[PDB]
Each structure stands twice: as C-alpha cells, then as structure tokens.
Design a protein around this motif. Structure first.
Motif, PDB file in Angstrom:
ATOM      1  N   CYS A  12       0.821  -1.205   0.000  1.00 17.17           N
ATOM      2  CA  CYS A  12       0.000   0.000   0.000  1.00 17.17           C
ATOM      3  C   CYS A  12       0.865   1.270   0.000  1.00 17.17           C
ATOM      4  O   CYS A  12       1.690   1.481   0.890  1.00 17.17           O
ATOM      5  CB  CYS A  12      -0.930  -0.090   1.214  1.00 17.17           C
ATOM      6  SG  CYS A  12      -2.057   1.331   1.249  1.00 17.17           S
ATOM      7  N   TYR A  14      -0.216   4.188   0.654  1.00 15.84           N
ATOM      8  CA  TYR A  14      -0.892   5.117   1.565  1.00 15.84           C
ATOM      9  C   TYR A  14      -0.628   4.820   3.054  1.00 15.84           C
ATOM     10  O   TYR A  14      -0.536   5.761   3.847  1.00 15.84           O
ATOM     11  CB  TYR A  14      -2.395   5.077   1.276  1.00 15.84           C
ATOM     12  CG  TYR A  14      -2.808   5.454  -0.137  1.00 15.84           C
ATOM     13  CD1 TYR A  14      -2.950   6.811  -0.483  1.00 15.84           C
ATOM     14  CD2 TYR A  14      -3.078   4.453  -1.095  1.00 15.84           C
ATOM     15  CE1 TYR A  14      -3.365   7.174  -1.779  1.00 15.84           C
ATOM     16  CE2 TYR A  14      -3.491   4.813  -2.392  1.00 15.84           C
ATOM     17  CZ  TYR A  14      -3.639   6.174  -2.738  1.00 15.84           C
ATOM     18  OH  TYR A  14      -4.045   6.511  -3.993  1.00 15.84           O
ATOM     19  N   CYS A  15      -0.494   3.539   3.435  1.00 16.13           N
ATOM     20  CA  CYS A  15      -0.230   3.102   4.821  1.00 16.13           C
ATOM     21  C   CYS A  15       0.893   2.045   4.978  1.00 16.13           C
ATOM     22  O   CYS A  15       1.202   1.626   6.097  1.00 16.13           O
ATOM     23  CB  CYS A  15      -1.543   2.687   5.503  1.00 16.13           C
ATOM     24  SG  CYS A  15      -2.233   1.168   4.797  1.00 16.13           S
ATOM     25  N   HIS A  28      -8.152  -3.090  -0.784  1.00 14.58           N
ATOM     26  CA  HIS A  28      -7.766  -2.288   0.378  1.00 14.58           C
ATOM     27  C   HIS A  28      -7.631  -0.793   0.029  1.00 14.58           C
ATOM     28  O   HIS A  28      -7.955   0.057   0.856  1.00 14.58           O
ATOM     29  CB  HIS A  28      -6.476  -2.879   0.974  1.00 14.58           C
ATOM     30  CG  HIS A  28      -5.791  -1.974   1.963  1.00 14.58           C
ATOM     31  ND1 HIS A  28      -6.111  -1.826   3.292  1.00 14.58           N
ATOM     32  CD2 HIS A  28      -4.738  -1.138   1.704  1.00 14.58           C
ATOM     33  CE1 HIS A  28      -5.272  -0.928   3.830  1.00 14.58           C
ATOM     34  NE2 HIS A  28      -4.416  -0.453   2.894  1.00 14.58           N
ATOM     35  N   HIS A  32      -8.681   4.378   1.114  1.00 12.43           N
ATOM     36  CA  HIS A  32      -7.762   5.491   0.869  1.00 12.43           C
ATOM     37  C   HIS A  32      -8.194   6.398  -0.301  1.00 12.43           C
ATOM     38  O   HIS A  32      -7.890   7.594  -0.294  1.00 12.43           O
ATOM     39  CB  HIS A  32      -6.380   4.887   0.573  1.00 12.43           C
ATOM     40  CG  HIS A  32      -5.750   4.136   1.722  1.00 12.43           C
ATOM     41  ND1 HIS A  32      -5.396   4.652   2.948  1.00 12.43           N
ATOM     42  CD2 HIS A  32      -5.315   2.840   1.693  1.00 12.43           C
ATOM     43  CE1 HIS A  32      -4.749   3.700   3.640  1.00 12.43           C
ATOM     44  NE2 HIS A  32      -4.653   2.564   2.908  1.00 12.43           N
TER      45      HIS A  32
HETATM   46 ZN   LIG Z   1      -3.378   1.140   2.958  1.00 11.98          ZN
END
Ligand SMILES: [Zn+2]
Length: 36
Positions: A12, A14-15, A28, A32
C-alpha cells in the motif's frame, strides 16, 4: 507442517501495509481513494 505460505508481495502506497496477492491490495485501496 508449515502454518502458511509467502513469496512476492504487494504494498500500500498510503499506509505501507503488505499483501500476498494483487487483488487483496487493490480492494484495500478503496479506504484510501474514491471513484465516480
Ligand atoms: Zn493502505
């Protein structure tokens, strides 16, 4: 016997969470990002 399996992963942007399959990450991303 082994408790599971591992290899090439998907991360990911984003995270920084990692997944075993592409579709697991792509689903997932919906927490986001959004689409219209
Ligand atoms: Zn994520």
């Amino acid at each position: 016997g082994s408790s599971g399996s591992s290899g090439k992963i998907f991360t990911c942007e984003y995270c920084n969470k990692v997944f075993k399959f592409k579709h697991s990450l792509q689903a997932h991303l919906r927490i986001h990002t959004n689409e219209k």
